[PDB]
C-alpha cells in the first residue's frame, strides 16, 4: 500500500496524532528566535551597509 504517502501525512498530522512534547511549539519558538534574530541582524547589517557603502 502507499505507506510512504500515509507516512508524510502521519508526520504532517503527527503534531496532533503522534507529536512528542510540544515539538512545533518548541520548534516554532526556536525557529522564530533563530529566524527573527537572523532576519533582524541581516536587516541591521544591510541597513548599516547602506550608510557605510
Amino acid at each position: 500500500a502507499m505507506e510512504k504517502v500515509q507516512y508524510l501525512t502521519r508526520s504532517a498530522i503527527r503534531r496532533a496524532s503522534t507529536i512528542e512534547m510540544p515539538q512545533q511549539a518548541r520548534q516554532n519558538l526556536q525557529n522564530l528566535f533563530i529566524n527573527f534574530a537572523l532576519i533582524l541582524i541581516f536587516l541591521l547589517l544591510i541597513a548599516i551597509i547602506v550608510m557605510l557603502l
Side-chain angles (χ1 to χ4, degrees):
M2 66 251 231
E3 246 308 290
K4 285 290 151 231
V5 158
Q6 215 184 104
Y7 234 90
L8 287 138
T9 306
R10 257 168 294 182
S11 234
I13 200 169
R14 142 164 67 171
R15 14 261 268 233
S17 229
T18 75
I19 182 165
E20 60 137 320
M21 232 206 204
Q23 173 136 115
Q24 272 247 241
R26 273 149 58 227
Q27 168 273 325
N28 192 82
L29 122 79
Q30 267 172 105
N31 248 112
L32 233 98
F33 236 84
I34 303 323
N35 283 126
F36 182 72
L38 101 79
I39 285 295
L40 197 118
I41 211 149
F42 169 73
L43 271 164
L44 261 159
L45 190 132
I46 201 143
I48 280 293
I49 291 298
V50 169
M51 298 168 288
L52 263 87
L53 206 89

Short mmCIF file of all heavy atoms in Angstrom, two decimals:
data_model
loop_
_atom_site.label_atom_id
_atom_site.label_comp_id
_atom_site.label_asym_id
_atom_site.label_seq_id
_atom_site.Cartn_x
_atom_site.Cartn_y
_atom_site.Cartn_z
N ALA A 1 0.85 -1.23 0.00
CA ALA A 1 0.00 0.00 0.00
C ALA A 1 0.88 1.26 0.00
O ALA A 1 2.07 1.20 0.23
CB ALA A 1 -0.82 -0.08 1.29
N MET A 2 0.29 2.41 -0.25
CA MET A 2 1.09 3.68 -0.27
C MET A 2 1.50 4.09 1.16
O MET A 2 1.15 5.15 1.65
CB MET A 2 0.15 4.72 -0.91
CG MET A 2 -1.06 4.99 -0.01
SD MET A 2 -2.55 4.29 -0.77
CE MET A 2 -3.58 5.77 -0.66
N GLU A 3 2.26 3.26 1.83
CA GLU A 3 2.70 3.59 3.22
C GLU A 3 3.54 4.88 3.23
O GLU A 3 3.34 5.74 4.05
CB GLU A 3 3.55 2.40 3.69
CG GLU A 3 2.84 1.69 4.85
CD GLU A 3 2.47 2.70 5.95
OE1 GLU A 3 3.37 3.19 6.61
OE2 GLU A 3 1.29 2.97 6.11
N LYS A 4 4.46 5.02 2.30
CA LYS A 4 5.30 6.26 2.25
C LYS A 4 4.41 7.51 2.14
O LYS A 4 4.69 8.54 2.72
CB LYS A 4 6.18 6.10 1.00
CG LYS A 4 7.29 5.08 1.29
CD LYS A 4 8.29 5.68 2.29
CE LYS A 4 8.93 4.55 3.11
NZ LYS A 4 8.78 4.98 4.54
N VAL A 5 3.32 7.40 1.43
CA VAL A 5 2.38 8.56 1.30
C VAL A 5 1.72 8.82 2.65
O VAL A 5 1.81 9.91 3.21
CB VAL A 5 1.34 8.12 0.27
CG1 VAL A 5 0.07 8.95 0.44
CG2 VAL A 5 1.91 8.32 -1.13
N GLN A 6 1.09 7.82 3.19
CA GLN A 6 0.46 7.97 4.53
C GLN A 6 1.56 8.27 5.56
O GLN A 6 1.28 8.70 6.67
CB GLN A 6 -0.20 6.63 4.81
CG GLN A 6 -1.50 6.85 5.59
CD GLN A 6 -2.11 5.50 5.95
OE1 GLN A 6 -2.01 5.06 7.08
NE2 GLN A 6 -2.71 4.81 5.04
N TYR A 7 2.80 8.05 5.20
CA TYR A 7 3.94 8.33 6.13
C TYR A 7 4.09 9.84 6.28
O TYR A 7 4.04 10.37 7.38
CB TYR A 7 5.18 7.73 5.46
CG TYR A 7 5.87 6.78 6.40
CD1 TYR A 7 5.52 5.42 6.41
CD2 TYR A 7 6.86 7.25 7.27
CE1 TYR A 7 6.17 4.54 7.29
CE2 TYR A 7 7.50 6.37 8.15
CZ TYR A 7 7.16 5.02 8.16
OH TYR A 7 7.79 4.15 9.02
N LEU A 8 4.23 10.55 5.19
CA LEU A 8 4.34 12.04 5.26
C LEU A 8 3.08 12.59 5.93
O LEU A 8 3.14 13.40 6.83
CB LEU A 8 4.41 12.51 3.80
CG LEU A 8 5.77 12.15 3.21
CD1 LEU A 8 5.59 11.63 1.78
CD2 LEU A 8 6.65 13.40 3.18
N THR A 9 1.93 12.11 5.50
CA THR A 9 0.64 12.55 6.11
C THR A 9 0.67 12.32 7.63
O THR A 9 0.40 13.23 8.39
CB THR A 9 -0.44 11.67 5.45
OG1 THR A 9 -0.33 11.76 4.04
CG2 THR A 9 -1.83 12.14 5.88
N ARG A 10 1.01 11.13 8.07
CA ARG A 10 1.08 10.86 9.54
C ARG A 10 2.06 11.83 10.21
O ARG A 10 1.81 12.35 11.28
CB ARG A 10 1.57 9.42 9.68
CG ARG A 10 0.39 8.51 10.03
CD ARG A 10 0.81 7.04 9.88
NE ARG A 10 1.05 6.86 8.42
CZ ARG A 10 1.39 5.70 7.95
NH1 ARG A 10 0.47 4.86 7.59
NH2 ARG A 10 2.64 5.39 7.85
N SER A 11 3.16 12.09 9.57
CA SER A 11 4.16 13.05 10.15
C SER A 11 3.63 14.49 10.05
O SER A 11 3.87 15.31 10.91
CB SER A 11 5.42 12.90 9.30
OG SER A 11 6.53 12.61 10.16
N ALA A 12 2.88 14.77 9.01
CA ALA A 12 2.29 16.13 8.85
C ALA A 12 1.21 16.33 9.91
O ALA A 12 1.01 17.42 10.41
CB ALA A 12 1.68 16.12 7.45
N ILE A 13 0.54 15.27 10.25
CA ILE A 13 -0.52 15.34 11.29
C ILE A 13 0.08 14.98 12.67
O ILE A 13 -0.51 15.27 13.69
CB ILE A 13 -1.56 14.30 10.87
CG1 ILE A 13 -2.89 14.60 11.55
CG2 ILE A 13 -1.08 12.91 11.28
CD1 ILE A 13 -3.99 13.74 10.92
N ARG A 14 1.23 14.34 12.68
CA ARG A 14 1.88 13.91 13.96
C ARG A 14 1.66 14.95 15.06
O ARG A 14 1.27 14.62 16.16
CB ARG A 14 3.37 13.77 13.60
CG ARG A 14 4.27 14.25 14.75
CD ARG A 14 5.70 13.73 14.54
NE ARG A 14 6.20 14.45 13.32
CZ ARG A 14 7.44 14.36 12.98
NH1 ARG A 14 8.35 14.96 13.69
NH2 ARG A 14 7.79 13.69 11.92
N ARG A 15 1.86 16.19 14.74
CA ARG A 15 1.65 17.31 15.73
C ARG A 15 0.39 17.08 16.58
O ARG A 15 0.34 17.42 17.74
CB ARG A 15 1.43 18.60 14.92
CG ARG A 15 1.15 18.34 13.43
CD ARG A 15 2.44 18.54 12.63
NE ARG A 15 2.39 19.98 12.22
CZ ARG A 15 2.53 20.32 10.98
NH1 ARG A 15 1.95 19.65 10.03
NH2 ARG A 15 3.26 21.35 10.68
N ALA A 16 -0.62 16.53 15.98
CA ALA A 16 -1.90 16.28 16.72
C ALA A 16 -2.16 14.79 16.89
O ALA A 16 -3.04 14.39 17.63
CB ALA A 16 -2.96 16.89 15.82
N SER A 17 -1.44 13.96 16.19
CA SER A 17 -1.70 12.48 16.28
C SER A 17 -0.51 11.70 16.87
O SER A 17 -0.70 10.67 17.48
CB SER A 17 -1.94 12.05 14.84
OG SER A 17 -3.12 11.26 14.78
N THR A 18 0.69 12.16 16.68
CA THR A 18 1.87 11.40 17.22
C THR A 18 3.00 12.34 17.67
O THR A 18 4.14 11.92 17.82
CB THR A 18 2.37 10.50 16.06
OG1 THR A 18 3.07 11.30 15.11
CG2 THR A 18 1.21 9.80 15.37
N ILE A 19 2.71 13.59 17.88
CA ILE A 19 3.76 14.55 18.31
C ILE A 19 4.36 14.18 19.67
O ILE A 19 3.70 13.63 20.53
CB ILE A 19 3.08 15.92 18.37
CG1 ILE A 19 4.10 17.00 18.74
CG2 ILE A 19 1.95 15.91 19.40
CD1 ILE A 19 3.52 18.39 18.45
N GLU A 20 5.60 14.51 19.84
CA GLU A 20 6.33 14.25 21.12
C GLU A 20 5.87 15.30 22.14
O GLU A 20 4.70 15.62 22.22
CB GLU A 20 7.79 14.48 20.73
CG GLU A 20 7.97 15.93 20.21
CD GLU A 20 9.24 16.56 20.78
OE1 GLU A 20 9.53 16.35 21.95
OE2 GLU A 20 9.89 17.28 20.04
N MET A 21 6.79 15.93 22.84
CA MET A 21 6.39 17.05 23.73
C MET A 21 5.93 18.16 22.75
O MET A 21 5.69 17.87 21.60
CB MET A 21 7.67 17.43 24.49
CG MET A 21 7.38 17.44 26.00
SD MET A 21 8.54 18.57 26.82
CE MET A 21 8.48 17.81 28.46
N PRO A 22 5.82 19.39 23.17
CA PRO A 22 5.40 20.42 22.18
C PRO A 22 6.48 20.56 21.09
O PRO A 22 7.30 21.46 21.11
CB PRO A 22 5.24 21.68 23.04
CG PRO A 22 6.10 21.44 24.24
CD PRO A 22 6.05 19.95 24.50
N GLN A 23 6.49 19.63 20.13
CA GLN A 23 7.51 19.65 19.03
C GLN A 23 7.45 20.95 18.22
O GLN A 23 8.44 21.64 18.07
CB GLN A 23 7.11 18.47 18.14
CG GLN A 23 7.96 18.45 16.86
CD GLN A 23 8.43 17.03 16.59
OE1 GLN A 23 8.05 16.42 15.60
NE2 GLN A 23 9.23 16.45 17.43
N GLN A 24 6.31 21.27 17.71
CA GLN A 24 6.17 22.52 16.90
C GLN A 24 6.15 23.73 17.83
O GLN A 24 6.65 24.77 17.48
CB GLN A 24 4.85 22.38 16.13
CG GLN A 24 5.12 21.66 14.80
CD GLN A 24 4.89 22.62 13.62
OE1 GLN A 24 4.04 22.38 12.79
NE2 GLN A 24 5.62 23.69 13.50
N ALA A 25 5.63 23.60 19.02
CA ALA A 25 5.65 24.76 19.96
C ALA A 25 7.11 25.10 20.27
O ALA A 25 7.54 26.23 20.15
CB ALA A 25 4.90 24.31 21.21
N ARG A 26 7.89 24.10 20.62
CA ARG A 26 9.34 24.33 20.91
C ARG A 26 10.08 24.66 19.61
O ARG A 26 10.99 25.47 19.60
CB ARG A 26 9.85 23.00 21.48
CG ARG A 26 9.63 22.97 23.00
CD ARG A 26 9.39 21.53 23.46
NE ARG A 26 10.59 20.76 23.02
CZ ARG A 26 10.45 19.62 22.42
NH1 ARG A 26 10.31 18.54 23.11
NH2 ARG A 26 10.44 19.57 21.12
N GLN A 27 9.70 24.05 18.50
CA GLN A 27 10.38 24.35 17.21
C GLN A 27 9.91 25.71 16.67
O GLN A 27 10.70 26.50 16.21
CB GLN A 27 9.97 23.21 16.27
CG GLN A 27 10.37 23.55 14.82
CD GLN A 27 9.26 24.36 14.15
OE1 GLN A 27 8.09 24.15 14.40
NE2 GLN A 27 9.58 25.28 13.29
N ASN A 28 8.63 25.98 16.75
CA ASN A 28 8.12 27.30 16.26
C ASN A 28 8.75 28.43 17.08
O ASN A 28 9.04 29.49 16.57
CB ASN A 28 6.60 27.27 16.44
CG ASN A 28 5.96 28.44 15.69
OD1 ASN A 28 5.74 28.36 14.50
ND2 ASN A 28 5.65 29.52 16.34
N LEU A 29 8.98 28.20 18.35
CA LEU A 29 9.61 29.23 19.20
C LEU A 29 11.09 29.34 18.81
O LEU A 29 11.63 30.42 18.67
CB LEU A 29 9.41 28.73 20.65
CG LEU A 29 10.74 28.55 21.38
CD1 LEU A 29 11.26 29.91 21.87
CD2 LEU A 29 10.53 27.64 22.59
N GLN A 30 11.73 28.21 18.62
CA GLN A 30 13.17 28.23 18.22
C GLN A 30 13.32 28.83 16.83
O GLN A 30 14.12 29.72 16.61
CB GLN A 30 13.62 26.77 18.25
CG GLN A 30 14.22 26.44 19.62
CD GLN A 30 14.49 24.94 19.72
OE1 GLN A 30 15.61 24.51 19.64
NE2 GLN A 30 13.49 24.13 19.90
N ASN A 31 12.54 28.37 15.89
CA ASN A 31 12.62 28.93 14.50
C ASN A 31 12.43 30.45 14.55
O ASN A 31 13.24 31.19 14.05
CB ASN A 31 11.49 28.27 13.71
CG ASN A 31 12.08 27.32 12.67
OD1 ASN A 31 11.94 26.12 12.76
ND2 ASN A 31 12.75 27.81 11.66
N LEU A 32 11.38 30.90 15.18
CA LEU A 32 11.14 32.36 15.29
C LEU A 32 12.34 33.02 15.95
O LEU A 32 12.84 34.02 15.48
CB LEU A 32 9.88 32.51 16.16
CG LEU A 32 8.86 33.38 15.43
CD1 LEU A 32 7.84 32.49 14.73
CD2 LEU A 32 8.14 34.27 16.45
N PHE A 33 12.83 32.46 17.02
CA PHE A 33 14.02 33.05 17.70
C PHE A 33 15.22 33.09 16.74
O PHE A 33 15.90 34.09 16.63
CB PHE A 33 14.31 32.13 18.89
CG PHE A 33 14.30 32.94 20.16
CD1 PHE A 33 13.09 33.22 20.81
CD2 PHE A 33 15.51 33.43 20.68
CE1 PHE A 33 13.09 33.98 21.98
CE2 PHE A 33 15.50 34.19 21.86
CZ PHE A 33 14.29 34.47 22.50
N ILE A 34 15.49 32.00 16.05
CA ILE A 34 16.65 31.98 15.11
C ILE A 34 16.32 32.74 13.81
O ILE A 34 17.14 33.47 13.29
CB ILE A 34 16.91 30.49 14.80
CG1 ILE A 34 17.17 29.71 16.10
CG2 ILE A 34 18.13 30.37 13.90
CD1 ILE A 34 17.97 30.57 17.09
N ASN A 35 15.13 32.58 13.29
CA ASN A 35 14.76 33.30 12.04
C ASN A 35 14.61 34.78 12.34
O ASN A 35 15.13 35.62 11.63
CB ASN A 35 13.42 32.70 11.58
CG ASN A 35 13.65 31.33 10.93
OD1 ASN A 35 13.06 30.35 11.32
ND2 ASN A 35 14.50 31.22 9.95
N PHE A 36 13.92 35.11 13.40
CA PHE A 36 13.76 36.55 13.75
C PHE A 36 15.13 37.19 14.00
O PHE A 36 15.43 38.25 13.49
CB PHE A 36 12.89 36.58 15.01
CG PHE A 36 12.62 38.01 15.41
CD1 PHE A 36 11.74 38.80 14.65
CD2 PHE A 36 13.24 38.55 16.54
CE1 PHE A 36 11.49 40.12 15.03
CE2 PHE A 36 12.99 39.87 16.92
CZ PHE A 36 12.11 40.66 16.16
N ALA A 37 15.95 36.54 14.78
CA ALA A 37 17.31 37.09 15.08
C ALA A 37 18.13 37.23 13.79
O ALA A 37 18.71 38.28 13.53
CB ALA A 37 17.95 36.08 16.03
N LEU A 38 18.20 36.20 12.98
CA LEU A 38 18.99 36.30 11.71
C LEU A 38 18.35 37.35 10.78
O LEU A 38 19.05 38.12 10.15
CB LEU A 38 19.00 34.88 11.11
CG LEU A 38 17.98 34.73 9.97
CD1 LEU A 38 18.55 35.33 8.68
CD2 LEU A 38 17.71 33.24 9.74
N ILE A 39 17.04 37.41 10.72
CA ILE A 39 16.40 38.45 9.86
C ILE A 39 16.69 39.83 10.46
O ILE A 39 17.06 40.76 9.76
CB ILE A 39 14.89 38.13 9.90
CG1 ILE A 39 14.61 36.90 9.03
CG2 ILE A 39 14.09 39.32 9.36
CD1 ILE A 39 14.91 37.20 7.56
N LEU A 40 16.57 39.95 11.76
CA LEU A 40 16.86 41.25 12.43
C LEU A 40 18.34 41.63 12.22
O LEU A 40 18.65 42.74 11.84
CB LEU A 40 16.57 41.01 13.92
CG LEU A 40 16.42 42.34 14.64
CD1 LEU A 40 15.02 42.46 15.22
CD2 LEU A 40 17.45 42.42 15.78
N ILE A 41 19.25 40.71 12.46
CA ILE A 41 20.70 41.03 12.26
C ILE A 41 20.98 41.32 10.78
O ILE A 41 21.68 42.25 10.45
CB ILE A 41 21.47 39.80 12.78
CG1 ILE A 41 22.81 40.25 13.35
CG2 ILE A 41 21.72 38.79 11.66
CD1 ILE A 41 23.23 39.32 14.49
N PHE A 42 20.41 40.54 9.88
CA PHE A 42 20.63 40.79 8.42
C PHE A 42 20.06 42.17 8.04
O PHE A 42 20.62 42.88 7.22
CB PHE A 42 19.87 39.66 7.71
CG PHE A 42 19.78 39.94 6.23
CD1 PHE A 42 20.92 39.82 5.42
CD2 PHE A 42 18.56 40.33 5.67
CE1 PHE A 42 20.83 40.08 4.05
CE2 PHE A 42 18.48 40.59 4.29
CZ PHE A 42 19.61 40.47 3.49
N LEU A 43 18.97 42.55 8.65
CA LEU A 43 18.36 43.88 8.35
C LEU A 43 19.25 44.96 8.94
O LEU A 43 19.65 45.90 8.26
CB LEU A 43 16.99 43.86 9.04
CG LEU A 43 15.94 43.30 8.09
CD1 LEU A 43 14.69 42.91 8.88
CD2 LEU A 43 15.57 44.35 7.05
N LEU A 44 19.61 44.82 10.19
CA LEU A 44 20.52 45.81 10.82
C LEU A 44 21.85 45.81 10.04
O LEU A 44 22.49 46.83 9.90
CB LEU A 44 20.73 45.31 12.25
CG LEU A 44 19.81 46.09 13.20
CD1 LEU A 44 19.62 45.30 14.49
CD2 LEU A 44 20.44 47.44 13.52
N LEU A 45 22.25 44.66 9.53
CA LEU A 45 23.52 44.60 8.75
C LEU A 45 23.35 45.26 7.38
O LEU A 45 24.13 46.10 6.99
CB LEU A 45 23.84 43.12 8.61
CG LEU A 45 25.26 42.95 8.05
CD1 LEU A 45 26.01 41.92 8.88
CD2 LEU A 45 25.18 42.47 6.60
N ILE A 46 22.31 44.91 6.67
CA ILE A 46 22.08 45.54 5.34
C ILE A 46 21.81 47.04 5.54
O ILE A 46 22.28 47.87 4.78
CB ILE A 46 20.88 44.80 4.71
CG1 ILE A 46 20.90 45.00 3.19
CG2 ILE A 46 19.56 45.34 5.27
CD1 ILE A 46 20.44 43.72 2.50
N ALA A 47 21.09 47.39 6.58
CA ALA A 47 20.82 48.83 6.86
C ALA A 47 22.13 49.56 7.15
O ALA A 47 22.37 50.64 6.65
CB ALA A 47 19.91 48.83 8.09
N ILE A 48 23.01 48.97 7.94
CA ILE A 48 24.31 49.63 8.24
C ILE A 48 25.12 49.80 6.95
O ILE A 48 25.69 50.85 6.70
CB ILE A 48 25.03 48.68 9.22
CG1 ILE A 48 24.47 48.90 10.64
CG2 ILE A 48 26.54 48.96 9.22
CD1 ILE A 48 24.86 50.29 11.15
N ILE A 49 25.16 48.78 6.12
CA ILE A 49 25.92 48.88 4.83
C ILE A 49 25.38 50.03 3.98
O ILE A 49 26.12 50.71 3.30
CB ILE A 49 25.70 47.54 4.13
CG1 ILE A 49 26.43 46.43 4.90
CG2 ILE A 49 26.24 47.60 2.70
CD1 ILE A 49 27.94 46.70 4.91
N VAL A 50 24.09 50.27 4.02
CA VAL A 50 23.51 51.40 3.23
C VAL A 50 24.21 52.71 3.61
O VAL A 50 24.60 53.49 2.76
CB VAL A 50 22.02 51.44 3.61
CG1 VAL A 50 21.37 52.72 3.06
CG2 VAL A 50 21.30 50.23 3.00
N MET A 51 24.39 52.94 4.89
CA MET A 51 25.08 54.18 5.34
C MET A 51 26.61 54.00 5.31
O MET A 51 27.35 54.96 5.37
CB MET A 51 24.59 54.40 6.77
CG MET A 51 23.08 54.62 6.78
SD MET A 51 22.46 54.53 8.47
CE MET A 51 22.66 52.74 8.68
N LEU A 52 27.08 52.78 5.20
CA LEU A 52 28.56 52.55 5.17
C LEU A 52 28.98 51.94 3.82
O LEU A 52 29.83 51.07 3.75
CB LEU A 52 28.84 51.57 6.31
CG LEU A 52 29.29 52.34 7.55
CD1 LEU A 52 28.07 52.78 8.36
CD2 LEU A 52 30.18 51.45 8.41
N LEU A 53 28.38 52.39 2.75
CA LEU A 53 28.73 51.86 1.40
C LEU A 53 29.83 52.71 0.74
O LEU A 53 30.79 52.13 0.27
CB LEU A 53 27.43 51.93 0.60
CG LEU A 53 27.44 50.88 -0.51
CD1 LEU A 53 26.87 49.57 0.02
CD2 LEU A 53 26.60 51.37 -1.68
#
